[PDB]
Amino acid sequence: HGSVINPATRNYGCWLRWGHDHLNPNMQYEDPMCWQAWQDNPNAMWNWNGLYRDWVGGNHRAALPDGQLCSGGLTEGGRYRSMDAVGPWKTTDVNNTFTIHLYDQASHGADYFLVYVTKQGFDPTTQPLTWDSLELVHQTGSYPPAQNIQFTVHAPNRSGRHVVFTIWKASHMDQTYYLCSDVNFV
Ligand SMILES: [Cu+2]
């Protein structure tokens, strides 16, 4: 159980920024995407480390229909479905070369990570996330059990607002985490 801490995923960030003030009506105006998320299902944030599927068998495309990538294909009864929403999600500023930092409290290890980034021209404020919209920019091999895992990726030919989609395949069983992070390539 865990998530990408940097660049923070959607639900981790929503928890981090608003967990201490989750019913604040001004969230609507300060962080509208976090607002809609908290409105829909507070557990998307309280259980921020739980965005996984079991028994995907490597078939990520089958498990995650277009427009449901960020929710893990509506995993856990749609718990994270608000992650699929379209709009001005808060971004982390990154360079074209950036570090992914995963935290996993259970130290499951990883068989691999896949890192996809949206193509130039994609607009996350108006368009749902699709497999077409993403290109694979990084692939790792396995990592031993550890609470913190990090590695550097390069996402070429990108500028401004994008989505980084990280697939983390745990080593303890066929459990796969699906981690969307909003970024701004500066
Ligand atoms: Cu776990």
Author numbering: 37 to 222
Q: Which of the paper's sentences describe this entry?
A:
Lytic polysaccharide monooxygenases (LPMOs) are auxiliary activity enzymes that also attack cellulose, as well as other polysaccharides, using an oxidative mechanism. LPMOs are compact globular enzymes that lack a substrate binding cleft or tunnel, and instead have a copper atom containing active site located near a planar binding surface. Thermobifida fusca, a model cellulolytic bacterium, secretes two LPMOs, the type I (TfAA10B) and type III (TfAA10A). These structures share a common immunoglobulin-like β-sandwich core fold, a flat binding surface, and a conserved N-terminal histidine.
The structure of TfAA10A was refined to a resolution of 2.0 Å with R and Rfree of 0.167 and 0.233, respectively. There are two molecules in the asymmetric unit with two copper atoms and multiple iodides. It has an Ig-like β-sandwich fold with a copper ion bound on the active site. An interesting feature of TfAA10A is the axial position of the copper coordination sphere, which is tyrosine. In most AA10 LPMOs and in TfAA10B, a phenylalanine occupies this position. The copper atom at the active site of chain A is 50% occupied and the one with chain B has occupancy of 31%. The active site of chain A has type I copper coordination in agreement with previous studies while the more distorted active site of chain B includes some features similar to type 2 with an equatorial water (wat550) in contact with the copper. Clearly, both active sites have been photo-reduced by X-ray radiation during data collection supporting the assumption that copper(II) is the catalytically competent state. Closer comparison between the Streptomyces coelicolor lytic polysaccharide monooxygenase and TfAA10A reveals almost identical backbone and His144, Tyr213, Trp82 and Asn83 at the same locations and conformations.
